[PDB]
Structures are given as C-alpha cells and as structure tokens.
Amino acid sequence: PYPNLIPSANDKPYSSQELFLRQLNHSMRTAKLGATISKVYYPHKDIFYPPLPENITVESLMSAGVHLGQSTSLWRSSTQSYIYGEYKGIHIIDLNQTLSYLKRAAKVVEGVSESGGIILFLGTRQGQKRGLEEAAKKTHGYYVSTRWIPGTLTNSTEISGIWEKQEIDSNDNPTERALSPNETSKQVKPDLLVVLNPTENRNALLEAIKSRVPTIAIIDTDSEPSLVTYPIPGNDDSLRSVNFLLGVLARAGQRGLQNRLARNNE
C-alpha cells in the first residue's frame, strides 16, 4: 500500500503525504473513540443496509417520510382509497396499506430475480441515480437515470440495436462465446420495470403495458395507480423515502438471487 510514498528524512519533519497518512491512521484507530452513537439516521445506510420486507414497520415508513402525499389541490381522486387523511394542506398516505403493497411488490421482485429475470430500475429524478445503480448492482439487474428514450421496448431494434449482449450460466458467469448476428439482434425485454417517478415517465409505463411487462411504481397522491401492475402508495418526491422503498426492493431481489444461486449450486 502507497508504493510511491517518498518518506521524509528522520531529522526533517513529516512531509504532506506522510502527515495525511498519519491522520488517516489516527482516524481508523482512535478518532471514533469517546462514544458510540446509537439511534441516528445516516442517509447512506439506507442504500447499503436496507431492511428486509418483513422487518419494515409503519413507524420506519413514517420516519422515511413515505406518508407525505402530494397536495390537497393536486389530487387525483383515483388514488382516494390509499389516502389516510389530510393535514398541513397535504394528503397523507395510509401507511399500513403502503406496507402491504410494498410487501407484495417486494415478493414479486424476489420471484423474478429467483427465476433469473431482467429487473430494470427507472428513476429520472435528480438525486436518485446512485441508489438506483446500487440496487441494480445488488440483484444482477439494470437501471436508467438519464432519460428513457421513448420506444426502448416498443422500438427496441432501432434504439437498443448496437449494444453488446452476453451469455450467462445458471450462475452469473459470462461464458464468453461469440453471439451470432441473428442471435444478437433480438430484443431483450425486461421481466420487471420498477419506476421511482411514474408521473414523470408515463411513456415508459405505456410501453411496458404494450410490451406486456409487469411493472412496479411509487404511486403518490397525484399519480394514476391503474397504470401499473403493483403500485406502492408513497412519497415519490422526497429522495430518502424513495431510496428506502427502492433499497427494500433491491434487498428482496438480492435474497431471491442468492436463493437461485444456492439452488444452482445444489
């Protein structure tokens, strides 16, 4: 480690790099020392250590901010059943309902991962990218943060024509043999589209239902819930609530992947 470090002379003081290394060493050993800080929210911890669908409660959802629906004046009355009441000039999403729908969604995510399906996480909002990529990594899955070019599934051959396809084991090993030009040009459709802002990409949803793909979406109090197969009522605007739901879904899919790998090994 640190092969190019030119250490200063013993008579001389520390160099800048040497000093930095010393600081790092101190940080690793004795900085986080005096106390330990239990019961506090670190944003990163929801992405890298999301809870299982089972262990989620209503309280956790409330803390995440999932309960906060759009607004009283921006109400799609189609979503009436999901909403608990109004408060602070804002519809508040029934969170027991949210929980049950999330569990249902989580189970279907797990199932397709187990079957070895292509899961696609779609999230066009600003802060969502990193968490989306993490989720995609967790299950051997896919994501979209930069905008969804209309017709990725309906007009697949024009759009997704010149990108490399692969082969895969019952495990996830590339088994790198040459794909034939006929073998390459076929569409590779997702087996689960999961969106974080269905109201912002109506188009993607429409192609999914045309292309015959089951889809999951965070339905806020202004979003149409009929436009998807498995709606999760919740707060799609705040970045952390979305991440929490997304991270849970990723964890559910991860589990199913692990189970598939285990059964392959067997």
Partner 1 sequence: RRIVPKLATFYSANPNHEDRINRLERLLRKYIKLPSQAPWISFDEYALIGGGTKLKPTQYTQLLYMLNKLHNIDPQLTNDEITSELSQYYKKIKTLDEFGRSIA
Partner 2 sequence: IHVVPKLPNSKALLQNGVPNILSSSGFKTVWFDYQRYLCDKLTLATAGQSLESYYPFHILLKTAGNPLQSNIFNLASSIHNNHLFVENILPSAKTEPSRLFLSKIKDSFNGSDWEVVKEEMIYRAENEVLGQGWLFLVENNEKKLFILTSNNNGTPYYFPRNQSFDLNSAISIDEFATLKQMKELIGKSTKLNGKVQDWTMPIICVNLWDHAYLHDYGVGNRSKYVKNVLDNLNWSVVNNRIFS
Partner 3 sequence: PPVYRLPPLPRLKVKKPIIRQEANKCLVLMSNLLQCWSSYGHMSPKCAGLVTELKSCTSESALGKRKSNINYHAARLYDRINGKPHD
- Applying CB under 5 A, which residues contact Mg ion? 220, 236
Q: Which is nearer to partner 1, 184 or 238 (CB)?
A: 184
CB 46 within 8 A of CB 243: yes
Residue whose C-alpha is closest to residue 128's, from 203, 38, 218, 214? 218
Residue whose C-alpha is closest to residue 199's, from 216, 224, 234? 224
| N-term to C-term CA, the chain | 39
Residue whose C-alpha is closest to residue 212's, from 188, 190, 187, 185? 190
14 binds partner 1 (CB under 8 A): no
266 binds partner 1 (CB under 8 A): no
CB 235 within 8 A of CB 69: yes
- In the sheet where 119-122 sits, what is the strand order? 142-144, 119-122, 192-195, 215-219, 230-233
Per CB under 8 A, residues contacting partner 3 are: 73-76, 222, 224
The nearest distance, CB 208 to partner 2, in angstroms, is: 40
The nearest distance, CB 166 to partner 1, in angstroms, is: 5
When CB distances are held under 5 to 8 angstroms depending on the partner's kind, the choice from partner 3, partner 2, partner 1, none that residue 158 binds is none
Please give the residue ranges that form the binding site for partner 2 (CB under 8 A).
10, 13-14, 18-19, 21-23, 25-26, 29-40, 42
Please give the residue ranges that form the binding site for partner 1 (CB under 8 A).
2-6, 16-17, 20-21, 24, 116, 118, 120, 133, 136-137, 141-149, 152, 160, 162-170, 175, 179, 183, 186, 188, 190
